[PDB]
Design a protein around this ligand. Sequence first.
Ligand SMILES: Nc1ncnc2c1ncn2[C@@H]1O[C@H](COP(=O)(O)OP(=O)(O)OP(=O)(O)O)[C@@H](O)[C@H]1O
Ligand SMILES: [Zn+2]
Lengths: 176, 238, 191, 373, 191, 133
Amino acid sequence: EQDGIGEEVLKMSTEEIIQRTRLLDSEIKIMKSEVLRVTHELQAMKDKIKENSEKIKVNKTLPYLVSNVIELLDVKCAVIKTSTRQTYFLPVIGLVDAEKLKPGDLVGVNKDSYLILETLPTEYDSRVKAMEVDERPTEQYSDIGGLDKQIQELVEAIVLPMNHKEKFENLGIQPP
Amino acid sequence: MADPRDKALQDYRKKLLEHKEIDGRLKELREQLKELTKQYEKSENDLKALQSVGQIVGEVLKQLTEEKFIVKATNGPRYVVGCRRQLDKSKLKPGTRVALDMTTLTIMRYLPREVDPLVYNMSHEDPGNVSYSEIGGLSEQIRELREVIELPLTNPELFQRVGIIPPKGCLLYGPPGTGKTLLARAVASQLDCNFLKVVSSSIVDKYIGESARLIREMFNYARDHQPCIIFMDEIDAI
Amino acid sequence: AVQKVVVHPLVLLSVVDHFNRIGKVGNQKRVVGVLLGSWQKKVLDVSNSFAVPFDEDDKDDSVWFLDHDYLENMYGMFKKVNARERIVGWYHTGPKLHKNDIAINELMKRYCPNSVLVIIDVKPKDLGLPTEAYISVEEVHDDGTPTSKTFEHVTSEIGAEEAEEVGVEHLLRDIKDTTVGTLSQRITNQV
Amino acid sequence: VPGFLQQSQNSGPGQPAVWHRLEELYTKKLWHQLTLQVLDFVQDPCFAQGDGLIKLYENFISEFEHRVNPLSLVEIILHVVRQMTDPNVALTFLEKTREKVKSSDEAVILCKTAIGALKLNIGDLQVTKETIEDVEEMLNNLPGVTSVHSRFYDLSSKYYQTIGNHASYYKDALRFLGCVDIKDLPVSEQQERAFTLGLAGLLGEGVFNFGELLMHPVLESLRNTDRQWLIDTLYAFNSGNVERFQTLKTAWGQQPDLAANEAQLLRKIQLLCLMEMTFTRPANHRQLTFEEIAKSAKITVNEVELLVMKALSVGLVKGSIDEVDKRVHMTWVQPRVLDLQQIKGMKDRLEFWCTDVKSMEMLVEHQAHDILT
Amino acid sequence: MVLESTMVCVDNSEYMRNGDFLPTRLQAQQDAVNIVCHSKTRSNPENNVGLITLANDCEVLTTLTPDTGRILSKLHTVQPKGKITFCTGIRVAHLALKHRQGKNHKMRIIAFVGSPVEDNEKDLVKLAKRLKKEKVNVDIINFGEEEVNTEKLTAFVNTLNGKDGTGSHLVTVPPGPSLADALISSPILAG
Amino acid sequence: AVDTAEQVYISSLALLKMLKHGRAGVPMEVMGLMLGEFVDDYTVRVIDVFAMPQSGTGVSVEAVDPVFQAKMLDMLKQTGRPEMVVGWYHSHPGFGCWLSGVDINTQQSFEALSERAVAVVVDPIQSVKGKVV
Ligand SMILES: Nc1ncnc2c1ncn2[C@@H]1O[C@H](COP(=O)(O)OP(=O)(O)OP(=O)(O)O)[C@@H](O)[C@H]1O
Ligand SMILES: [Zn+2]
């Protein structure tokens, strides 16, 4: 703040109403020239990204096909094996990237273009599905008589690794 | 009007509160425009990626003449197709794998090998980032083991100066818990190129020839990739 | 840095289409439109084109007009129906060109950096004279002469891909001139 | 401020009719008829002693200026700071005027030339290669100023007073005479323009005359009155003859910078006469013997072979040398400019070529019409 | 409701950066373009407003289009650094009036002149008798500096619409403050 | 007041616009409209053939955009020549030529709106050796 006052004290009619006019005139005329320019460029690009997101949506049909990703190359390039025992290959994958996939995925495939566009959350055999038992009823520990030491030694073994995740990391050990 | 030291000291202070006010949101307007171009680039990358025909994967049986290539798809019939322009037909070895056009059926791009995503899972995993320091009392056995592995894959000139070919590998037998799987962490952390981990129990199947097909599929990845290590645990099963 | 162009036969007859369109009332004796392209690496290739209303006063030979809104509409339609084909330049007919072709080119270089023009010949078709092309160059002149434009020539050709020759061959059907000739076509080739 | 121009109204012939116009155009807030009138004042060939009075007015312009094209601002301040004649502060003054306008107008490019032309008097090694290179780096995307190349040519003539600058100087002298169109200065400086043009192309390593100077009247219409030795020695080189009289009378007439280069210019005409004496014979019996070169280039037998090894190493010819017949073969590959008298036979040998190719076409069409169809 | 083709003409010569007005003359001619295109639009939304320059080249920057959002973006950073060329500016504005997408509108040109003209009196009267044979009304409005009642402008405005013509008002701006009230009195409604 | 034997006059650039647009998207059933001129009762001509922007539906009446066509036709009135559509086209790469399930309906909609509206079928995968079907 001292440099703005000291240029008002020494000189009076050299750069008071000159320096504080010529660079402030040049600033606002650039700012007036760019406040409509960046805005008009903003609005036109919002239209072009709308027309494309419209055009991606119209070509987006619903009926898809499942397949299996075999590999991935770059000279980007991915090998598709469909569910009709048919193998395919593309130069470019599609709407999903190359670095978010892996071999063994059940991607949604266009029936004509054979384009990868969907993820399809990849279920498996029904046997471990039958092994999934949720909704465990809360059994009060006092139902157990006489075995309360083993209860604690279990709760010391598992529940505190579940709760105090960072107490076991700064100490220097690993929970069993 | 005139030239004071008070009014011309307050002349620009009512102005500097505007010229940075009009300038401050310009950086917000340029950054929003820059992200919008980044979003527009990805949309245009989606538009160009919308037109993809897809190429039929097939394999070259043999070469009939200088333009006639007997190829075959993975399940379909056999075709007689040719090449595009500069596809370097001398590389098209009878048994390579190519990508055929969907409609023209001719050869677009040749593909090196397959991966078989079953054995993809025996490739990608981290050992431990361990550094010969999470192991104790074994430096006689360790240095002897590192001697036969590291030296051919690093410095074969010593084996020239002797002449003698280096041998393949070692066996880590021992009563359990001694730390035998901990070494496979160590060699796959430092000087690692291609480290396969075979459990040697999951390679059996209900179909009669499938286990042998897995083994050759494991070794062709080993010839695909140069220097590579195949760790098979527990030979006692198989 | 253009080696050579290779436009299909689609715009070739077109211009003659548009020259046949204007000749009922037109007294311009030249047709100026907009060339489209697909610039691949170094060689150039044209598949499609279109025309645009253009007149030029013979007095003072420096007054021209181009409709850019019609250019901004119709090109955006073509990119919408076909997102492969883009602007590469322009074209006109008539061997004797008027001297506003520098003025046409310097304006629409705001569209295409390597802007390029193709001259066709609608009326001369008797001798051996295919299309002709130039390149947009800005130098002094040589060394010791005043500064100038000096339109440099780039060689041309008429390429022909698949799936149009069957449409070409089935439209010929008059002499058709089959390949390698039985000694009489080869002498005419040397004549 | 208006009293300052009334007290500085003097020092210029016929004061009030231009100073009343100066103060009125000052008050109409225009910037062009004022600037032409200030440019008219500085261009007035006087002693121009009012530099201290005009520097305060050029300061007074620049305070409320904020509108004018800075090109003519710096085009006149280079005339101002040259009239001040003070190189101690002229560099700091010019670097202040360069940094004060950094706008889209390419005025830095003529400031950097104004840096070098004022600095190339003393200590000319430290920034001089840099201040010449920064101009040619900044001569892009716009071949339309023609002053920046003019000021680039002016400093290169100031840089010509060095040890090694002779080949790039002559090519620069061709560019500036090309970019300029009008002459707008009398012959009494133009005669030394063409004279140092004649030396730098003669003291060129690979540039002997190169053509495109007999056609341009910028030398023959300006020196046909004085110094006829220089026009004649360019004629004997384009003719390619030795002509020992005329190539000596120039060695008498021009004493400096010709004594240490006389054996060089003998070497240049001995390599040059070949590629025209093989042009005198139209590729019929181009197997020429050593005797005719020894007669034409007046050189001995034991030096024609060192002569033609140099000429093949230059690259104006790619012929061979046979000594089982002692006849030198010539495949002349480097063309030049020629006059209309040698165009005449060249047009005839085109017509002879034309009337044979046509006549042979009549013979084929006559013979093979019946199986032409 | 009236159907015309409004072709505004601007000046970006070197004699525009004087700023005799209290604002910049560029800002004064910009708002002049603003209040006339707001006037032609609300009177009839079926017209079209398009800007044209004439200094050092008559570059058609905006096509004669009924949209105005493009023009409002093209009013900025015009870079007035050329020399005023007025003689071909009429002929290049008429050739824009001949290329129209609809041959139903009326033809009216307004012009902004902020620099003195240097042209022969023969040239303007050949152009004025050309506009009589073509039935075209052009308005001439002066900005900034102006020599009062010049012969070349007054004889042109007279010979443009002779024998009870339109009433093309020759606006003479004062070099004082002189805001847009001089331009919205007569000509905005009574052209 | 009935047909006898009509004759379609196609131009050289018409069929060239047919093959390139048909070859362009082969497995996506390209779809455009045919523009010509009814010169009399039983001869009909077509010189100018343009394409239509396709959709996810494919060859149907829904892929025919009305607001795009009238915007396109208006811009063709000033450049070249204005005329009226005389039919349509589509591509059947899967077989030869016959009017499909929805091709017959959009035929009825065109001959109820326009006069007779002849439908052209081009097989791009067949136009290979020296002939076109
Ligand atoms: N000698 C040792 N030094 C340091 N750590 C060891 C040692 N032996 C075992 N470990 C610990 O053992 C773990 C590795 O398992 P380990 O290799 O001992 O099982 P194993 O010996 O392979 O058992 P099995 O022989 O039954 O397969 C590591 O977490 C490591 O911390
Ligand atoms: Zn159909």
